[PDB]
């Protein structure tokens, strides 16, 4: 199976998922000087007051915090988007060391981690249908830097010891994802893909400019997770990021001057 190791990592993925070498792959480097301010972009609308978290799952690649997406409870709209996109899950990508971990980069800078809030376009009815469409998903990406703790992250951190290994899940209700946002919703946006297999070219990416800060201690607990299943040789869950891919024929737009 695919993963992040030496033998099954990003440089191998194209052998089973040829779209890995496609024309709208993610992540990318965001060249801040080349990104054009687009005064026609809207403020984003992040409506998470009725979000219903259900469960957290170690899927062998990351951990996903899952939401009830059976009604418009937690939705993303506006910005570059047409229509309404429902929150299904969030997850992170992180490094073995603070100097790497993000998937997007900003003028080649790597952040310690990157949060992805994954949303699907309601016009397609369910997530599986959405990922087959070029405007099927909207992923809100937020960089993490190490400094002061993020108080709204600690609930997530504290449940990680209960889902150490692949396939473990735990009940995770009443978690408010608004506590993971930065102050500003200034963003860059471009058309891209999933950053893991199957690498489908179905995402409008919205990457916030302002990182959140989390503590060393919080990230260290991410790095205690395991890629392996229970009882299997321990492989720490670290460096679960895909590097930047060719920009090709795409324009990154900025919401801000
Ligand atoms: N890291 S990311 O681009 O946000 C991300 C990669 C993978 C997803 S959900 C993966 C997947 C894709 C297709 C199906 Cl049908 C079920 C799950 S979001
Ligand atoms: Zn992701």
CB 211, CB 16: distance < 8 Å: no
- Cα angle value 78/184/57 (rounded, 5°): 75
Which of 10, 66, 118 to mutate to test ligand 1, by most ligand atoms within 8 A of the CB atom?
118
CA 85 to ligand 2 centroid distance, Å: 17
114 vs 144: CA distance, rounded Å? 6
User: Which resolution, in Å, applies to this structure?
Assistant: 1.2
Per-residue DSSP letter, 3: -
| Cα(135)–Cα(133) distance, integer angstroms | 5
CA-based end-to-end distance of the chain: 44
- What is the rounded distance in angstroms from the CA atom of residue 43 to the CA atom of residue 103? 24
33 a known binding residue?
no
Cβ atoms of 42 and 78 within 8 Å: the answer is: yes
Measured distance CA(115)–CA(153) in Å, rounded:
11
As a whole number of angstroms, the distance between CA 120 and CA 77 comes to: 11
Structural domain of residue 255, as residue ranges? 1-257
- Which CATH number do you get for residue 163? 3.10.200.10
Number of domains in the chain: 1
Alpha carbon distance 239, 223 (integer Å): 9
57 CB neighbour count, 10 Å cutoff? 20
Q: How far is CA 189 from CA 44, 117, 132, in A?
A: 11, 14, 20
Torsion over CA: 44, 210, 121, 175 (sign): negative
Catalytic residue positions?
Answer: 61
Distance 203 CA to ligand 1 centre (A): 10
The torsion angles phi and psi of 166, rounded to 5 degrees, stand at -50, 130
Ligand 1 centre to CA of 92 (Å) is 12
- Smallest CA-to-CA distance from 238 within 48, 47, 95 is with 95
φ, ψ at 245 (rounded to 5°): -105, 165
- Residue 154 CB burial class (10 angstroms; 0-12, 13-18, ≥19): middle
Hey, what are 201's tokens? 């070219």
Q: Which atom of ligand 1 is nearest to the CA of 103?
A: 1
From the CA of 195, give the closest atom in ligand 1.
Answer: 3
Contact criterion met (CB below 8 Å) for 100 and 109: no
Preceding amide of 234 cis, omega within 30: no
Query: How many other β-carbons are positioned within 10 Å of the β-carbon of residue 72?
Result: 14
């Amino acid at each position: 199976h695919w993963g992040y190791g030496k033998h099954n990592g990003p440089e191998h993925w194209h052998k089973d998922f040829p779209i890995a070498k496609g024309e709208r792959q993610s992540p990318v480097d965001i060249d801040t000087h080349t990104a054009k301010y687009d005064p026609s972009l809207k403020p984003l609308s992040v409506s998470y007051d009725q979000a219903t978290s259900l469960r957290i799952l170690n899927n062998g690649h990351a951990f996903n915090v899952e939401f009830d997406d059976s009604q418009d409870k937690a939705v993303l709209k506006g910005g570059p988007l047409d229509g309404t996109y429902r929150l299904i899950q969030f997850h992170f990508h992180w490094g073995s060391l603070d100097g790497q971990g993000s998937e997007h980069t900003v003028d080649k800078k790597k952040y310690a981690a990157e949060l992805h809030l994954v949303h699907w376009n309601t016009k397609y009815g369910d997530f599986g249908k959405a990922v087959q469409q070029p405007d099927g998903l909207a992923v809100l990406g937020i960089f993490l830097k190490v400094g002061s703790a993020k108080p709204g992250l600690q609930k997530v951190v504290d449940v990680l010891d209960s889902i150490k290994t692949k396939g473990k899940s735990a009940d995770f209700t009443n978690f408010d994802p608004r506590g993971l946002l930065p102050e500003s919703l200034d963003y860059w946006t471009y058309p891209g893909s999933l950053t893991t297999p199957p690498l489908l070219e179905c995402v409008t990416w919205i990457v916030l400019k302002e990182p959140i800060s989390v503590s060393s201690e919080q990230v260290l607990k991410f790095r205690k997770l395991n890629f392996n299943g229970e009882g299997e040789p321990e492989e720490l869950m670290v460096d679960n990021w895909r590097p930047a891919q060719p920009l090709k024929n795409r324009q990154i737009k900025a919401s801000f001057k």
